[PDB]
């Protein structure tokens, strides 16, 4: 009748080991960052549209629109030094899915962070959906030119409070992440249009799944295919106030969800606990770790 033998992490955990779970997609979202020291930019804890007043923003978002940006981009810059953080350091979550990676498992990661650690830890372009984009590259804005740079070169305009040009025809140089008035990249329908075809296994990690069309990647995967949620918050159940492929984690009739209450590190290591790889996640975030901090 179901994939899962039980529906817990041992579950999860003998699935994953069994013959049939090949190809695992992960959903990705802020909470695989905050205990990174990245701040949730969206819970109200961190107060991001707050102390904008001296920008004279027609609208707080404003901010993060790419019209207005295009004609007043100093106080996003301004913002980007404010919040800049101090070390790009990933988290035991990161380096479990280049633990997948490793071992073949991993088709695909989606992300909803810009703070690149996915690529730190060390997931390739290839492996990564960067739905929101990211600030790992940056593009020279005229349609024409789209010059390249890379963080290294942004990090010295921004914390000298130059406003970033281009080297080549002096337009605005911007962070490859999506603001508003863009349109999410096409490789994220793309992508997603094929590797659902193939997902055994859908792993969801730090992401409440309020923010669409990413939360409607869940019901892209075949009915058969088991989601293992690990996050703060139980997520992804259909919405009362709504009126279908969401998260049944409770009912009679679950069969396939799972959910882990708690950090998304500590879940990460639970499961690679079960899987036999917690001395190979631990050696592995101890050197990469070692090394980031000998910079
Ligand atoms: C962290 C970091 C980092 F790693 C590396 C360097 C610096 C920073 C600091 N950092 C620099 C960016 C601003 C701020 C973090 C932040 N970015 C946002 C944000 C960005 C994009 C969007 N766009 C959408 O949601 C969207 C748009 C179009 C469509 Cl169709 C659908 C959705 C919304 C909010 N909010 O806060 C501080
Ligand atoms: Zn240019």
């Given at each position: 009748e179901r994939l899962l033998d039980e529906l817990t992490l041992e579950g999860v955990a003998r699935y994953m080991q069994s013959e049939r779970c090949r190809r695992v997609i992960c959903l990705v979202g802020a909470g695989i960052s905050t205990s990174a020291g990245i701040?949730?930019?969206?819970?109200?804890?961190?107060?991001?549209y707050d102390n904008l007043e001296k920008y004279h923003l027609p609208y707080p978002e404003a901010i993060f629109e790419?019209?207005?940006?295009?004609?007043?981009?100093?106080?996003?810059?301004?913002?980007?030094?404010?919040?800049?953080?101090?070390?790009?350091?990933?988290?035991?979550?990161?380096?479990?899915?280049?633990?997948?990676?490793?071992?073949?498992?991993?088709?695909?990661?989606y992300t909803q962070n810009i703070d690149t650690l996915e690529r730190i830890a060390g997931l390739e372009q290839e492996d990564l959906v960067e739905a929101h984009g990211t600030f790992y590259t940056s593009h020279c804005v005229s349609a024409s030119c789209r010059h390249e740079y890379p963080l290294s070169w942004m990090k010295e305009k921004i914390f000298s409070e130059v406003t970033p040009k281009c080297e080549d025809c002096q337009s605005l140089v911007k962070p490859d992440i999506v603001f508003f008035g863009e349109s999410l990249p096409a490789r994220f329908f793309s992508c997603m249009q094929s590797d659902f075809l193939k997902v055994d296994l859908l792993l969801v990690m730090?992401?409440?799944?309020?923010v669409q069309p990413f939360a409607s990647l869940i019901?892209?995967?075949?009915?058969?295919?088991?989601?293992?949620?690990?996050?703060?918050?139980?997520?992804?159940?259909?919405?009362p106030f709504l009126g279908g492929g969401g998260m049944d984690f409770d009912s009679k009739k679950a069969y396939r969800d799972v959910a882990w209450?708690?950090?998304?590190?500590?879940?990460?290591?639970?499961?690679?606990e079960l899987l036999g790889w917690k001395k190979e996640?631990?050696?592995?975030?101890r050197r990469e770790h070692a090394s980031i901090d000998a910079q």
């Amino acid at each position: 009748e179901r994939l899962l033998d039980e529906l817990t992490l041992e579950g999860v955990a003998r699935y994953m080991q069994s013959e049939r779970c090949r190809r695992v997609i992960c959903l990705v979202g802020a909470g695989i960052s905050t205990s990174a020291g990245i701040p949730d930019f969206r819970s109200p804890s961190t107060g991001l549209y707050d102390n904008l007043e001296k920008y004279h923003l027609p609208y707080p978002e404003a901010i993060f629109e790419i019209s207005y940006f295009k004609k007043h981009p100093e106080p996003f810059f301004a913002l980007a030094k404010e919040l800049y953080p101090g070390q790009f350091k990933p988290t035991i979550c990161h380096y479990f899915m280049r633990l997948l990676k490793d071992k073949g498992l991993l088709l695909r990661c989606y992300t909803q962070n810009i703070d690149t650690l996915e690529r730190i830890a060390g997931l390739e372009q290839e492996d990564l959906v960067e739905a929101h984009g990211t600030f790992y590259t940056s593009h020279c804005v005229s349609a024409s030119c789209r010059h390249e740079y890379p963080l290294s070169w942004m990090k010295e305009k921004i914390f000298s409070e130059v406003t970033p040009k281009c080297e080549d025809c002096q337009s605005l140089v911007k962070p490859d992440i999506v603001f508003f008035g863009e349109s999410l990249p096409a490789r994220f329908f793309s992508c997603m249009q094929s590797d659902f075809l193939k997902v055994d296994l859908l792993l969801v990690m730090g992401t409440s799944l309020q923010v669409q069309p990413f939360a409607s990647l869940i019901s892209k995967a075949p009915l058969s295919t088991p989601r293992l949620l690990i996050n703060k918050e139980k997520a992804g159940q259909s919405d009362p106030f709504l009126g279908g492929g969401g998260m049944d984690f409770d009912s009679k009739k679950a069969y396939r969800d799972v959910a882990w209450l708690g950090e998304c590190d500590q879940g990460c290591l639970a499961l690679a606990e079960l899987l036999g790889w917690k001395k190979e996640l631990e050696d592995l975030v101890r050197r990469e770790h070692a090394s980031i901090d000998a910079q």
